[PDB]
Ligand SMILES: Nc1nc2c(ncn2[C@@H]2O[C@H](COP(=O)(O)OP(=O)(O)O)[C@@H](O)[C@H]2O)c(=O)[nH]1
């Protein structure tokens with residue numbers, strides 16, 4: 001099974017799904033539009049959380065970075081009054097270097113991802129959506145900037161007026177991911193940001209058409225009128241899509257076959273039908289691995305039905 | 306006073322010299338031929354040691370790196386079995402980054418040094434010999450490799466056949482270093498490797514000529530027939546230089562005025578007079594900071610007389 005992942009929402013669903021099926025059978029196509037080179041090294045926030053989740057070192061308190069990771073280099077620079085851009089731990093920085101080096105030797109992002117997987121001994125198959133550069137810029141009333149500067153740098157406070165995912169047009173679906181799609185027909189769209197996470201992935205040239213030939217199940221990242229987290233609340237509207245389990249469904253309307261939103265939003269059954277997808281409510285507020293496991297079973301069943 | 310330095314000998318003499326004259330007056334021109342980019346950030350071993358020496362945070366046990374540094378990012382990659390090249394401390398890396406960020410934003414090596422200086426509060430004037438790149442490769446009986454790979458990597462065991470200081474011929478004396486020679490008239494050649502540390506500096510175009518117009522004093526880095534430490538043992542001879550307090554004085558023959566070698570070998574003082582430099586013995590073996598201050602006073606007295 002193939003799973004499009006963001007960096008929080010989906011990896012949580014994965015936290016439970018990796019208890020339902022066999023890991024080797026789980027291939028994850030991770031978003032890279034959030035990637036960024038910091039302090040001389042490439043950081044793949046999304047791609048990393050997934051590696052860390054499966055390598056069993058993810059900090060479940062915030063869902064980013066390694067658990068009990070030290071902050072030497074960081075804290076030292078904090079004393080000198082120099083913000084690095086994001087809290088980078090020592091062990092976490094190792095992932096950035098280990099990867100970057102490989103990239104520096106001519107190898108690709110996927111290559112590094114592979115080596116990182118083998119190093120962490122993760123049975124699953126993590127694969128960045130694309131080897132080509134893609135950056136998510138957020139057009140705010142204060143000025144156009146990078147996602148990181150907006151979310152972390154500005155605490156997601158700026159007033160968003162637009163979203164610009166650059167390079168996605170010139171990017172190419174990772175050959176390893178295309179290869180994976182061949183021997184697969186079940187693709188899950190984790191409950192992650194539709195604009196800045198799934199967006200970049202489905203926006204890659206050929207993807208949208210490739211997703212049609214497969215059975216696509218999706219878990220709404222919106223519970224009510226707003227997301228469980230993240231700036232999807234400002235991005236989505238300012239992007240055209242309405243912040244609702246209904247909007248999310250319309251967004252993937254071109255390929256979404258089975259949808260699964262939260263029960264707190266029981267909505268028109270025939271409404272979803274007009275979009276051409278089988279709806280279904282369920283408890284999606286993953287408050288623990290058990291809830292993730294519980295919702296994951298609901299998902300595994302969605303495919304089966 | 307201008308002072309040519311390496312990363313061990315000279316910064317040791319400096320350790321005492323900084324107790325004799327007002328720091329503001331100490332201008333240190335460090336060697337950058339040892340510089341190399343590691344794990345995405347530029348490292349300047351010589352330039353860094355001097356920075357840590359005055360910022361009073363240098364590890365005096367090995368005389369490199371920060372005192373009581375942690376190694377999170379290091380030990381981590383160690384586990385994953387990845388050699389980074391050199392043991393990089395976490396705080397020590399913060400330096401590499403801070404400097405590198407400035408370099409990457411359009412600033413020069415010298416700029417990064419000035420900022421790190423104030424960031425560390427050092428009053429002295431630490432300046433790299435040049436903003437341009439220069440690397441010291443050693444031709445061993447195993448192939449042409451980089452100094453780091455030779456000394457740190459191969460423990461310096463490989464049989465040296467020749468030394469190549471690439472770039473120096475196309476490098477240019479740092480604008481600030483030249484601006485320094487404009488004001489100062491006292492040049493002290495610290496007791497560092499005359500081939501791979503001091504050499505690189507006096508090899509810069511138009512440099513060996515500026516030394517002729519100034520009062521030059523040097524301290525033999527070779528006590529007897531071998532150096533207190535450093536690969537000075539193989540490099541010098543394999544490069545065509547006599548490994549002795551005598552060969553040293555001969556090397557800087559074209560600009561040397563006052564020479565100060567160890568007392569453990571009262572050489573033919575008349576041999577020096579017909580070498581173009583006033584010899585002088587002294588306990589150059591710097592055991593503690595007191596021995597440095599002690600010797601540092603003999604150096605000031607040498608310039609005064
Ligand atoms: N259903 C559900 N959605 C969640 C949960 N936690 C986070 N999310 C959603 O997952 C998304 C976070 O995924 P991601 O794209 O990685 O987030 P970002 O980079 O932090 O903005 C948000 O849109 C949230 O609404 C959860 O426990 N349950």
Ligand SMILES: Nc1nc2c(ncn2[C@@H]2O[C@H](COP(=O)(O)OP(=O)(O)O)[C@@H](O)[C@H]2O)c(=O)[nH]1
Nearest residue numbers: 311312313314497498502532533534535589591
């Ligand atoms: N006279 C004297 N020389 C020293 C002392 N400590 C180290 N040295 C010499 O200084 C040199 C080391 O200088 P440097 O270029 O900084 O060394 P590197 O970091 O090993 O490449 C060697 O040639 C040593 O023999 C000391 O206490 N007294």
